[PDB]
Amino acid sequence: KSFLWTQSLRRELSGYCSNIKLQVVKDAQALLHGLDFSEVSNVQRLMRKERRDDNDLKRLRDLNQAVNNLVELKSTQQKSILRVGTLTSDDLLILAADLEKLKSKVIMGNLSSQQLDQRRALLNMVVRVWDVKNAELLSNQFGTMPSLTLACLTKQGQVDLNDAVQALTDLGLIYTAKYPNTSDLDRLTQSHPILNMIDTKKSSLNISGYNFSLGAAVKAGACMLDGGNMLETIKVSPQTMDGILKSILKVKKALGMFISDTPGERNPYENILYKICLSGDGWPYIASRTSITGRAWENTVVDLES
């Protein structure tokens, strides 16, 4: 069902998808030339600690800003108000409800640097927490960005930007047919040594786009084919915003898509919905969103008047 939703969305939204290989590669080059890959290493590590504090968060956000400055594919703060227009009044009700659903789903001791030894000893025979003053500051700092994935694969893997691009393109083609997985990645590593860098055993949840993952690599590979009607390459603007939501609603109806309740499962529908509604101006899947403040349900509001 998941991949079916994904594919129905792709076909429906194909008109809003664009060719962005060029930009993504241009942006990767910018990062390769301008970014401090020494600090990239540090932030990678800092993000992997189980106890993470404000000093680590500040480190992450600073790096994010550095990256925001080198890249052209950004999302900008753009509040959206949805009104009865190309959107029906029933549609506003669905959206207003589903945004609420998203909101609602969102609603271990004192040591130390000895957690490192706890780990080793435990292994001898990994939930990660934040200790932060204001947790708003985590919002939008943890996303994945193709141009960044490319850059890090390239410097850290010590290969040509091109070798990375070709490898990820293969992931991208597979992705048009199925959700690539660990075995597929392993079979692809023969022809593409660079993919050894994506270690799926060592990858994890909420550790930022500076660390590698199969999911992030697939997101990147999607931007490598100038076609495929990949959702990743969708651009949103204030004009095109309603048309996109309406097209999504049409698929939602047709396939009976919905927002899950189980906190762990995040599906094609809630993914595209949260991503679109975060800002009415950017590339919802693949841009630099570190500048954005707030969540989708705050940045997009429904207006039942009429």
Partner RNA sequence: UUAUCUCA
Summarize as ranges the residues that interact with RNA (CB under 7 A). Answer: 1-3, 102, 105-106, 128-130, 132, 135, 138-144, 179, 181-183, 198, 200, 203-207, 209, 211, 213-216, 219, 263-266, 270-271, 274-275, 278, 285, 295-296
β-sheet bridge partners, residue 82: 302
Rounded to a whole number of angstroms, the minimum distance from the CB of residue 55 to RNA is 15
Nearest alpha carbon to residue 173 among 183, 163, 184: 184
**E runs forming strands in the chain:** 51-53, 80-82, 129-131, 300-302
Q: What are phi and psi of 40, to 5 degrees?
A: -60, -45
Q: Which is nearer to RNA, 81 or 127 (CB)?
A: 127
Rounded to a whole number of angstroms, the minimum distance from the CB of residue 120 to RNA is 21
Q: What are phi and psi of 285, to 5 degrees?
A: -95, -35
Rounded to a whole number of angstroms, the minimum distance from the CB of residue 139 to RNA is 5
Q: Which is nearer to RNA, 96 or 132 (CB)?
A: 132
Rounded to a whole number of angstroms, the minimum distance from the CB of residue 292 to RNA is 9
β-sheet bridge partners, residue 244: none
Write the DSSP assignment of 205-240 as a string of letters. Answer: TTS-TTS--HHHHHHHHHTTSS-S--GGGB-B-TTT
As a whole number of Å, the end-to-end CA separation of the chain is: 37
Q: Which is nearer to RNA, 143 or 221 (CB)?
A: 143
Rounded to a whole number of angstroms, the minimum distance from the CB of residue 281 to RNA is 15
Q: Which is nearer to RNA, 105 or 155 (CB)?
A: 105
Q: Which is nearer to RNA, 5 or 87 (CB)?
A: 5
**Is the CB of residue 20 less than 8 Å from the CB of residue 140?**
no
